[PDB]
Amino acid sequence: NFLRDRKTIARIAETAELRPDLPVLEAGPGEGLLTRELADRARQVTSYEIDPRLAKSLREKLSGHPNIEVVNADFLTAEPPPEPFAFVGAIPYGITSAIVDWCLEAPTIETATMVTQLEFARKRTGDYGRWSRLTVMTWPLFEWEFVEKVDRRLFKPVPKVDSAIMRLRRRAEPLLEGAALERYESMVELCFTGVGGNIQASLLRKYPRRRVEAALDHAGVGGGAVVAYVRPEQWLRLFERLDQ
């Protein structure tokens, strides 16, 4: 699926929050129009194309841009650069979670701007109230933002479902660090298993009743809340009170 709509392509490039001293890594470059717009704004673009024939034609198509390099390789086995950078990608359906993990694990990444299936982006950004476990776990380190829906008819060939632009931003200052962050991650893990039936019952496996009740109230969360509908700001408040 190749995005052809010029307005959406420009929206992606502007979403990436690029600047002249920041390099970009790109995956799923397709026709390379987006690559041109990224190269206009960033220090340089390194664009990954796994297919050797497509890599060669893309390299020639973009040879009028000296700050574009095309790498004939699988992006998923690429190492991130040891300097701040941004990722931009149009991600096929079957490797979306793996690309997200690639970005979450790159310690110098600033932003990751991705075109994904619509439902994937909504879950990972809580756009309709339901929250991914990974989003909650990484919220102290990353912002997850839903940018916009992208209608199927803007691609070629036209797919079956709609897409979306979503963005990760690595926070300049993490909301938690060190052992406190680990204690937060342990709390989130504990609650997403569902042991005991409800979030209150799960928390009671690790924390005293008096403190659990105080923490739920502090966070504005009911003892029987559906775990997936607790918001990240509520998880932080819950941990704040529990960790005293």
Numbering used by the authors: 42 to 285
Task: Give sentences copied directly from the paper behind this entry.
ErmE (EC 2.1.1.184) is a dimethyltransferase from the actinomycete Saccharopolyspora erythraea, from which the first macrolide antibiotic erythromycin was originally extracted.
SEC analysis and examination of the structure in PDBe PISA33 confirm that ErmE is a monomer. Superposition of the catalytic domains of ErmE and ErmC’ in complex with SAM suggests that SAM will bind similarly in the lower part of the pocket, with the methyl group directed towards the upper part of the pocket, where the substrate adenine will likely bind. In the ErmE structure, a sulfate ion is bound between Lys164 and Arg174, possibly mimicking a substrate phosphate.
